[PDB]
């Protein structure tokens, strides 16, 4: 039922976008079908984690507060596809980083996906009192993610910024705002229960869960084999400010830091294996267990503070926290 | 006075954006000063044609309709920098088309410039009744420009689309909406005289002036020498659907079209000179004079229809039409 409606609203959104291009933007069928295929390729196929969270939050707030039900659930599905389209926009921008027409189309497709989030919001929410507030928080978080990518890209240029606090700054703006806080807030807005929740506890929860997932994501990028990860680990070669790097630099000797700096950020197969050897020989994945258990304990506590004033909202956050844990 | 205030509001806008990053987004001084230099490099230096049009329209409507004056003129300057920032966003996206960090920063800088148009609008216009309508028309035109770039990039893939009507479709969405119609509309919105103008005549004027400038721009891209153009002409090598190409294909023989198709879209110095030879030997720049005179006559007529209901607005359009003519 949740996924079956989420895909049904996708058909309704796509039909509006493509018909608007044909009827209002004077687009020929060849380019309409091309944009249909590009939309299905970049937006469909994933796990829809962010989009389904919006639907999960809106369900808990209408059942725990009738034509109002159909309106809120449909609005949540549109907001869910706004984030899914925004993630597709981010994925296209990543493909560009790594008279050529296929690059011109990739750049143009990234801008179209970003614009489609505005068009589907201006259309389905034209008669909603929260349209202006929804677009403001949406674009502010998109601005936050771009600022977060600047911290992540320039984390090794200006090892001075390889600290745990700066790691939290990167995860906060690069991941935590649009992956965890944005879907929760969009669920509160379509349910019109935005002023009925403690946003401080909610924001603090999103940062903790965002940081928890990133530490697990950094370890998998290093030790999980390529076939079991769905990609090829590249944080070592890219000299990324990962949780493993900042935790190593804090508990290593001068030679181990010297050997780390002489091997980190290189593409040689044996210099990367030397980095992994330094990670293994420091019992870092022992610190990984305790660090994650400490964060998970902080997640359980903040959910209870949020339930005293918003019970049904915390139930949907326990579901979101389960999909990460 | 017009430029002196336009640059003064730039300082006010930049100070808000950079302080917000320092105070709210936890940005260090090194990256704040970096974004200051990137902002000044991509946004300043140009002619500010689009931005100054917003100020030109707002002046004519308040004088021809007092703390209301300072509010409208300041709002027009902010809207002017919204388009100037949007143009800087488009210019950065063009540089990308033609672990490398300088490409990561370019892509990120393009997204930041686009987001800064939203942030400066959400801040200075937070208490304005037109904020939601301003953002909607702004993003819809940005979506229009991206659709226009798809028509221009794919104009030679699917010479079937090398027609005069399709040329008008490209110029309409790629150039005419955000270069001529957008600054005029933003001047009407900050002056709150949006429902007091014939938008059909206004839209038709922007398309005619946008198409007029593009034909002149296409000829200069071909015949104006590189030092007198500010760039290097590349429409022939890129196989662009220029006004010269579509006008040539309509009045050429079978061999001349065959020789055109065998030389167009190539980078050879002599194949491009063969294309220019075919353009010269067809008296195309004779058709250029008559075509531009016909468009200019249509511009003079539509201005008079618009003055019968909006006199002061037409005076600012005669000034904008003078900067193209
Ligand atoms: N001078 C320019 C540049 C430009 N760039 C642009 C705009 C929207 C989307 C994409 Cl992919 C590129 N569009 C029109 N005129
Ligand atoms: N998986 C991703 C991708 C991603 N891309 C992105 C977002 C904003 C700006 C820029 Cl330049 C790139 N950001 C976070 N997570």
- For A176-242, the DSSP string reads IIIIIIHHHHHHHHHTT-GGGS-HHHHHHHHHHHHHHHHHHHHHHHHHS-HHHHTS---TTTTT---
Backbone φ/ψ region at A192: left (φ over 0), alpha (ψ -120 to 50), beta:
left
B188 vs B55: CA distance, rounded Å: 10
Cα–Cα distance between B68 and B47 in angstroms, integer? Answer: 28
Atom of ligand 2 nearest to the CA of A153: 11
Give the relative orientation of helices B243-250 and B284-307 as an angle to the nearest 10 degrees: 120
Cα distance between residue A139 and residue A82, in whole Å: 11
SS (H, E, C) A269-298: HHHHHHHHHHHHCCCHHHHHHHHHHHHHHH
Q: In which residue are the tokens 């033609």 written? A: B98
Question: CA triplet A62, A64, A70: central angle to 5 degrees?
Answer: 15
Give buried/exposed letters for B216-244 (b at 16+ CB in 10 A, else e): bbbbebbbeeeeeeeeebebbbbbbbbbb
Q: Chain A partners of B146 at a C-beta cutoff of 8 Å?
A: 108, 111-112, 115
In 3D, which of A149, A323, A214 has the Cα closest to residue B115?
A149
**For residues B242 and B202, what is the distance between their CA atoms, to the nearest angstrom?**
25
Q: Is the CB of A94 within 6 Å of ligand 2?
A: yes
The separation between CA A275 and the C-alpha centre of its own chain, rounded to angstroms, equals 28
A301 close to A317: Cβ distance less than 8 angstroms? no
Is residue B203 within 8 angstroms of chain A, CB to CB? no
Cβ(B171)–Cβ(B210) below 8 Å: yes
Q: Quick one: which H or E segment has residue A49?
A: helix A49-63
Of A233, A149, A144, the closest CA to residue B101 belongs to A149
What DSSP line would sit under A291-322, residue for residue? HHHHHHHHHHHHHHHHHTT-HHHHHHHHHHHH
Task: Collapse the DSSP code of A53 into the 3-class scheme (helix H, G, I; strand E, B; otherwise coil) and give the result.
Answer: helix
Q: Is B142 annotated as ligand-binding?
A: no
Q: Judging by beta carbons within 10 Å of its beta carbon (0-12, 13-18, 19+), is residue A56 exposed, middle or buried?
A: buried
Whether A111 and B93 lie within 8 Å, measured CB to CB? yes
Question: CB-based contacts of B131: which residues, under 8 Å, 6+ apart?
Answer: A132, B121, B122, B125
Resolution of the solved structure (Å): 2.3
CA angle A295, A301, A306 (to 5 degrees): 125
Rounded Cα–Cα distance for residues A71 and A125 (Å)? 10
CB-based burial of residue A145 (10 Å sphere; 0-12 exposed, 13-18 middle, 19+ buried)? Answer: buried
What spacing in Å lies between the alpha carbon of B119 and ligand 1's midpoint? 21
**Which of B1-35 are b and which e, b meaning 16 or more Cβ less than 10 Å from the residue's Cβ?**
eeeeebeebbeebbeebbeebeeebebeeebeebb
- By the 8 A CB rule, do B217 and B292 touch? no
N-terminal to C-terminal alpha carbon distance within chain B: 24
Tokens of A40: 């299905």
What lies within 8 Å, CB to CB, of B283 at 6+ separation is none
Enter the tokens of residue A263: 């091997």
Q: Which of B37, B113, B126, B146 to mutate to test the interface with A (most CBs of A within 10 A)?
A: B146
| Distance in angstroms (rounded) separating the CA atoms of residues B255 and B260 | 8
Cα dihedral across residues B88, B89, B90, B96: positive or negative: positive
Interface check for B33 against chain A (CB to CB < 8 A): the answer is: no
| Closest CA–CA distance from residue A63 to any residue of chain B (Å) | 31
Task: Give φ, ψ of B204 to 5 degrees.
Answer: -65, -35
State the DSSP string of B193-241.
Answer: -GGGS-HHHHHHHHHHHHHHHHHHHHHHHHHS-HHHHTS---TTTTT--
Alpha carbons A319 and A52: distance in angstroms, whole number: 11
The closest of A257, A168, A242 to A209, measured between CA atoms, is A168
Which residue from A199, A222, A282, A298 is spatially nearest to A248, judged by alpha carbons? A282
Distance CA B89, CA B215 (A): 24
Nearest CA to ligand 1 atom 5: B90
Which H or E run contains B121?
A: helix B101-124
Partner B contacted by A225 (CB < 8 A): no
Residue closest to A139 by CA, chosen among A177, A167, A166, A105: A177
| Residue where the block lists tokens 């309704």 | A12
- The answer to whether residues B57 and B191 touch, using CB atoms and an 8 Å cutoff, is yes
Residue A319 tokens, joined: 């579901």
Q: How many helices (H) and strands (E) does chain A have?
A: 15, 0
DSSP tag of B183 = H
- Is the Cβ–Cβ distance between A291 and A215 less than 8 Å? yes
CA gap A13, A35 in Å, rounded: 13
- B97 close to B69: Cβ distance less than 8 angstroms: no
CB contact under 8 A, B108 and A26: no
CA distances in angstroms from A36 to A42, A113, A299, listed in the order given: 10, 12, 41
C-alpha angle B316-B320-B325 in degrees, rounded to nearest 5: 140
CA dihedral (A101, A106, A111, A116) in degrees, to 10, reads 110
Nearest CA in chain A to B165: A26
Report the distance separating Cα A10 and Cα A48, nearest Å. Answer: 12
For chain B, positions 88-117, list CB contacts with chain A under 8 A.
Answer: 93, 96-97, 99-101, 103-105, 107-108, 111-112, 115
Q: Which long-range contacts (CB under 8 A, 24 or more apart) does A269-277 make?
A: A272/A236, A272/A237, A275/A236, A276/A222, A276/A223, A276/A236
State the residue for tokens 């090194």: B30
User: CA torsion sign, B166 to B169 to B175 to B180?
Assistant: positive
CA distances from A254 to A241, A250, A257, A261 (A): 19, 11, 5, 10
**Nearest of B39, B46, B38, B52 to residue B13 by alpha carbon:** B39
Angle of helix A269-280 relative to helix A284-307, nearest 10 degrees, comes to: 70
Residue A254: CB atoms within 10 A of its CB come to 7
Question: What is the token pair recorded at A174?
Answer: 């690069």
Alpha-carbon A42 to chain mean position: 15
Cβ contact B234:B247 at 8 Å: no
- The residue among B300, B76, B304, B313 whose CA lies nearest residue B197 is B313
Residue A266 to chain B, least CA–CA distance (Å): 10
Show the ligand 1 pocket: residues with CB < 6 angstroms: A 107-108, 111; B 90, 93-94, 145-146, 149, 174
Contact by Cβ (8 Å): A77, A87: no
Q: Which residue's C-alpha comes closest to atom 8 of ligand 2?
A: A146
Enter the tokens of residue B140. Answer: 């819809």
Asked whether the beta carbons of B101 and B58 are under 8 A apart, the reply is no
Q: Does the beta carbon of A144 lie under 8 angstroms from any beta carbon of chain B?
A: yes
Alpha-carbon distance of B184 to B177, in angstroms, equals 10
> How far is the C-alpha of B18 from the C-alpha of B120, rounded, in Å?
11
Give the 3-state secondary structure of residue A126.
coil
Residues A257 and A263: their CA atoms lie apart, in Å, by: 10
- Cα B116 to Cα B148: distance, rounded to the nearest angstrom: 23
Nearest to A132 among B21, B99, B131 (CB): B131
| H or E element at residue A164 | helix A164-171
Residues A169 and B24: their CA atoms lie apart, in Å, by 12
Would you state the structure tokens that stand for residue A212, as one six-digit string? 């928890």
Residue B208 and residue B295 in contact, taking contact as beta carbons nearer than 8 Å? yes
d(CA A304, CA B271): 74
Residue B156 in contact with residue B241, Cβ under 8 Å? yes
Q: Are A220 and A214 in contact (CB under 8 A)?
A: no
Annotate A231-243 with b (16+ C-beta within 10 A) or e (fewer): eebebbbbbbbbb
Distance B110 CA to ligand 2 centre (A): 13
Name the method of structure determination: X-ray
Q: Does A118 touch chain B (CB under 8 A)?
A: yes
Q: Does B232 touch chain A (CB under 8 A)?
A: no
10 Å Cβ neighbour count for B36? 14
Q: Would an 8 Å CB–CB cutoff place B137 in contact with chain A? A: no
Which tokens belong to B85?
């920032």
Closest alpha carbon to A19 in A7, A32, A8, A3: A32
CA atoms of B282 and B274, how far apart (whole Å): 12
Pair A136, A207: CB distance under 8 Å: no
Q: Of how many residues is chain B composed?
A: 325
Q: At what angle do helices A101-124 and A2-23 cross, to 10 degrees?
A: 110
Residue whose C-alpha is closest to residue A309's, from A179, A188, A225: A188
| Cα angle value A104/A81/B103 (rounded, 5°) | 30
Q: Which of A155, A35, A14 is nearest to A81 (CA)?
A: A14
Report the candidate in A220, A90, A237 with the shortest Cα–Cα distance to residue A149. A90
Q: Which residues, 6+ apart, have CB-to-CB distance to B48 below 8 Å? A: B3, B6, B80, B84
How far apart are alpha carbons A21 and A39 in whole angstroms?
14
Burial of A256 (0-12, 13-18, 19+ CB in 10 A): middle
């Amino acid at each position: 039922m949740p996924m079956q409606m989420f895909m049904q609203v996708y058909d309704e959104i796509q039909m509006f976008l493509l018909e608007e291009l044909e009827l209002k933007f004077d687009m020929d069928p060849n380019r309409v079908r091309y944009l249909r295929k590009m939309m299905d390729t970049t937006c469909l196929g994933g796990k829809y984690n962010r989009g389904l969270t919006v639907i999960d939050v809106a369900e808990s707030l209408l059942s725990l507060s009738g034509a109002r039900r159909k309106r809120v659930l449909h609005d949540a599905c549109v907001c869910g596809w706004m984030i899914e389209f925004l993630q597709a926009h981010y994925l296209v921008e990543d493909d560009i980083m790594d008279p050529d027409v296929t690059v011109q189309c990739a750049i143009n497709d990234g801008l179209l996906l970003k614009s489609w989030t505005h068009m589907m919001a201006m259309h389905f929410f034209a008669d909603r009192p929260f349209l202006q507030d929804l677009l403001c928080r949406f674009n502010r978080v998109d601005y936050t993610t771009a600022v977060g990518q600047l911290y992540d890209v320039t984390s090794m240029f200006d090892f001075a910024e390889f600290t745990l606090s700066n790691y939290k700054r990167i995860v906060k703006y690069k991941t935590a705002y649009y992956t965890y806080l944005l879907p929760l807030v969009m669920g509160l807005i379509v349910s019109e229960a935005l002023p009925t929740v403690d946003m401080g506890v909610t924001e603090e929860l999103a940062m903790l869960m965002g940081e928890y997932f990133q530490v697990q994501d950094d370890v998998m990028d290093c030790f999980t084999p390529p076939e079991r990860l769905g990609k090829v680990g590249t944080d070592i070669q890219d000299a990324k400010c990962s949780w493993l790097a900042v935790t190593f630099l804090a508990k290593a000797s001068s030679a181990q830091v010297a050997e780390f700096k002489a091997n980190y950020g290189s593409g040689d197969s044996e210099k990367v294996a030397t980095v992994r050897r330094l990670y293994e020989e420091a019992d870092l994945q022992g610190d990984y267990v305790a660090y994650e258990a400490a964060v998970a304990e902080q997640v359980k506590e903040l959910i209870e503070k949020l339930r005293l004033c918003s019970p049904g909202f915390a139930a949907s956050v326990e579901t979101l926290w389960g999909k990460t844990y």
